[PDB]
Structures are given as structure tokens and as C-alpha cells.
Symmetry: C2
Subunit: 308 residues, 2 copies
């Protein structure tokens, strides 16, 4: 008597990254035993429980909202954060940081925009947030932006950061940042993170994570633009709505090619919300544009997949 | 023997505008008999046929992709457009303009970003596209951007425009632009638009359209930031996947409050993909945060709704 489980029939390129507001481009697998994989956006169980900093909107990912104060002698502004819905932010909620906060160390560039309530006057400036910086303390309710202005923003008016891409310091080793697998210190460098979605890894010999990969826009320097999420944003929204009970630890998915009627590969969708495949090595999967994932049966962690 | 029709159970504030990449904020109704309502994004039949310039990604709305050429003596660049998937653009496809092209007259500001293939060097600059301007000819394969640089972009490298918000000329009447209900001339001012999704209007006495409303960020001046879509982007994605046959011209939806177990109002979801309500006048609906739409039955255009 369990509600039947399903995944969307959208193709990979019809879906959105859950860790930055950009389309998915491809599937990728590679080894990850040497480091901790613990993203906080795009985290959702198959029965629809959102985890980490995950929220439902594709366009809120890596945004910030609040009001700003200028730092004298610079073009930097401190943003005192509001909640996702523009209310007072509560640092005691059982989350790592405000919902949608970036979950990687990087220099994220976009625009800071603001509207003055009284007259509807507006202003917008290019801005960058360094999520590895000392003033990056979103859990405590504040972050800092570097901008292209020293005077134009007003205090005590609603201000939004819309992310666009990432930057790197061209005087240093190319592609050395962002570091997509390094979590920010959400409460600053001396405080440990809390309420995290758990780290993930394959347990089965010969398996690797299967990542849903995009390329972030680059805005300066020589950034590492790869961005891998564990679940498309549309899968997060789907599971949240369906809330179908997990009948075992692992849902077996087949990736099907409608142009031949044949299965390309099978994979495990773990109930805690990540996918594994039987492959060793780094590999950009080559998939048909109409290929789709299809749930076939409940298995468990002991199931041996056919090699990808 | 028709597949049962459904709408998502996401609440309004859990969904995304289909005409600009921003969250929905509220439902709004107002009269629109005096002008043509003919948006091209967020257009989809209830049985899943995308119309106009509508595509499936929330984050591709109002983006452009291609490569750029500098216009000497200015900070303007012409973008020679690529298709949504970065391939050669075909002006003969039976669409009004490339998928995701803006469907309103306005000055849309964001960032133009670029990556040089050979070395992975990147660059990003603030940029604005005037969709009412003479060089706005996306159907013909080109648009113009005003930027903050006269030399930094390379030719013949992939370049992306990511929209953020809108601007207005503060020396003129406040809130006189954008004009969300004026279509661009996709092939320029002397050529009529083609392959459009149809104009929509209530036919029933005492009915008005029900709009899914957001506020676009403003980036300069005193813009009109209201943005009304006919369907949330998540509804477009849902109908596209479900493809449930329309059993009549109109699906009757009830908007339900789970905190009381009572219906707040009922509305008509027309099979061609828009909603009407029985109300006269401009009205910001006040809805509970957990309220949701629920499909109850197939009716037709002659059905009399209870007053909203």
C-alpha cells in the first residue's frame, strides 16, 4: 500500500542544476573516494524531505536578500540578510545557513539590485561575494559584497543579489577556484557548520557517483567552471510533491533511448537522494538528446549493476 | 479512457515566473479588455504543447547566446545568435524568435559573459538589451547590447547574456517602461511577427484573467517592475510531461486552504493555457502560504464561476 515512486521524464538537457541557476548539460562520473562530497543545495530524499540549505526554486539558488551598509574607504558593502521570503532572519533555525546560500567556496559574481520603497527608484551594480572569505557568515546573518560603487546604494532598502557566474585570480594557478566540493564556513572560520545534509559516497566496489553537470559562466580569470549536482532541481521539486515512500534503500533506474527502444545503462537512486553507476574513471557520458531515466524496481545497496 | 489531468501541488510562492527567471510572489487579477494580452513565454496547452517562444527551463527565460562583434566608437556589441543549445540558429523554424527570447518591450540589464575556448580565460560585463530598439532583431539572428566596455570582449567566442532586471529613463514619466504587454518586433520594426501564441481574453461576463505575478528587479531609474505570466513555469513543465488530454475546453480548479479545509475561490483553466476568475477590478489576491490549486472537473466556457 505504498504510493508508487517515479522520477520525471524530462531529459537531462531539459532540467536545471540544483546548485546554481543554470541548465544541466551532461552526466558525468568520476572517483570521489579521496575527498568528502557534501553539497547542501540539491539535497532531497526520494520521499520528498528537503535537506541542507535546499529550497524549491531554481532561481533562488545562490541568491541573497537583505539590506546593505557601505564599508568606508572601499567599494564593499555588508548585507544584513533577510530570510528567503524577506522576513527577519532567524539564526536558530535548524539549517546550515539561509536557504539557497551557496554551498561551495568560490567568488560568485552577479548584480546587486535595490529599490527605494518611497519613490520606486532603483539601482544595480556588479558585485562579487567571496564565499571563502572571513566576512562570509551567512548563518550569523551577514555577508560582504565587493561592488563597482562607493556611494550609490541606500541603507535600509531591500537589496537582492542575483548570481551569474564565477571568477578566478589570474595571477595564480589556472582553475584553482572555485572549489565546488569545499563547503563554506557558514558561521565564519572558527565555528563549525551545523545541520548539514550528510556526505555521500558509493559503497559498492566498482561504483562511482553519477553527477548532473553544468558549466558555470566565467566572469574573470581562469575559473574552474564545472558544477556537479546530485539531483536535478526538477527531481527535488518532483519528490517534494509526490512524497512517495521509499520501499527499500535503493531505486533501480534504467536510462532508456527511445530512438532504439534499448536501455543504455542502469543506475542506483539511493533513497537519501543521490545516484551511483558501475564505472571506474572519469567519464563524460554520451547520451541521446531524448534519453530519459525510468524507475523500474526497488532493490538495495547489495544489488550489482551492469557495468555502465 | 483519457489520462487524468492534474496541476502541481506547489504553492504560488514555491513556483517560478514563466516570463522572467524570478519567483512568483502573488496572484493578481485586473481588466484587460482594452489591450491585447499575447505573451509568448509561459505558453503551453493543458495537454502539453508548448507555444510561442516557450521552452522548458526557468533559467533560460530572457537569455541570449552567441558570439559578439564590437561597434566602433561605442560600448555596444552586436550578438549573432546561436540556438538555445548553442548550435547554428535557423531563422526559418516556425517560432516567433529563438526560444526564451524576451516577450516584452523593455530595457533588460544583466551580465554578458564569455569564455575563450583555447585557454579558458573569461570575462564578464554589465550589459543591457533594449527589446524595443531598431537593432532588436532576434528572429533574424541578431540583437545589440550596450555594455560597460569598448574592447574587452573577443570575437568568435561563446558569449551568454544572463538577465537580472530592468531599467527606465528617469528623465521621463516614472514607470512608463517596461511595457510588459507590448511584444517586441522580433524581425525589426518593418516586419510583422509570425507563429505567435494567440492573444487571450475572458469571454464570460464578469470574468478577468488571473495572473501569476512577480516583481522584476530594477537596475536604474523608475521602472514598472510588475510581471504577469499566464502559467507558472512549473505548470508548463508539468503539462509537457503529463500530456493529459483535455476532455473539454475548461478545467475547473478550486484553490484550497489546508489550514481550514475550505475552498477560497474557483477558477477556469482554459485548455489553451490561461486562467480566468469571476471578479471586476484590479485586485491583489490575499492567499494563505499553504494554499494550492486542485483540479476538480472538466466544464466548458459556459460555466458560471462563483464570484472570487
Amino acid at each position: 500500500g505504498s504510493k508508487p515512486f517515479t522520477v520525471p521524464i524530462l531529459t537531462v538537457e531539459e532540467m536545471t542544476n540544483s546548485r546554481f541557476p543554470i541548465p544541466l548539460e551532461k552526466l558525468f562520473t568520476g572517483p570521489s573516494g579521496a575527498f568528502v562530497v557534501q553539497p547542501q543545495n540539491g539535497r532531497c530524499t526520494t520521499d520528498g524531505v528537503l535537506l541542507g540549505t535546499t529550497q524549491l526554486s531554481p532561481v533562488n539558488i545562490c541568491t541573497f536578500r537583505g539590506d546593505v551598509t557601505h564599508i568606508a574607504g572601499s567599494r564593499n558593502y555588508t548585507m544584513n540578510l533577510a530570510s528567503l521570503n524577506w522576513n527577519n532572519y532567524d539564526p536558530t533555525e535548524e539549517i546550515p545557513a539561509p536557504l539557497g546560500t551557496p554551498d561551495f567556496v568560490g567568488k560568485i559574481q552577479g548584480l546587486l539590485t535595490q529599490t527605494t520603497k518611497g519613490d520606486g527608484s532603483t539601482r544595480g551594480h556588479k558585485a562579487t561575494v567571496y564565499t571563502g572569505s572571513a566576512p562570509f557568515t551567512p548563518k550569523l546573518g551577514s555577508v560582504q559584497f565587493s561592488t563597482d560603487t562607493e556611494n550609490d546604494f541606500e541603507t535600509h532598502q531591500n537589496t537582492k543579489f542575483t548570481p551569474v557566474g564565477v571568477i578566478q585570480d589570474g595571477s595564480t594557478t589556472h582553475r584553482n577556484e572555485p572549489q565546488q566540493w569545499v563547503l563554506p564556513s557558514y558561521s565564519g572560520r572558527n565555528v563549525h557548520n551545523v545541520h548539514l545534509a550528510p556526505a555521500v559516497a558509493p559503497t559498492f566496489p566498482g561504483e562511482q557517483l553519477l553527477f548532473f553537470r553544468s558549466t558555470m559562466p566565467g566572469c574573470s580569470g581562469y575559473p574552474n567552471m564545472d558544477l556537479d549536482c546530485l539531483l536535478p532541481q526538477e527531481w527535488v521539486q518532483h519528490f517534494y510533491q509526490e512524497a512517495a515512500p521509499a520501499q527499500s534503500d535503493v531505486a533501480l533506474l534504467r536510462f532508456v533511448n527511445p530512438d532504439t527502444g534499448r536501455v543504455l545503462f542502469e543506475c542506483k537512486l539511493h533513497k537519501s537522494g543521490y545516484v551511483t553507476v558501475a564505472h571506474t574513471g572519469q567519464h563524460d557520458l554520451v547520451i541521446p538528446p531524448n534519453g530519459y531515466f525510468r524507475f523500474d524496481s526497488w532493490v538495495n545497496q547489495f544489488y550489482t549493476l551492469a557495468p555502465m
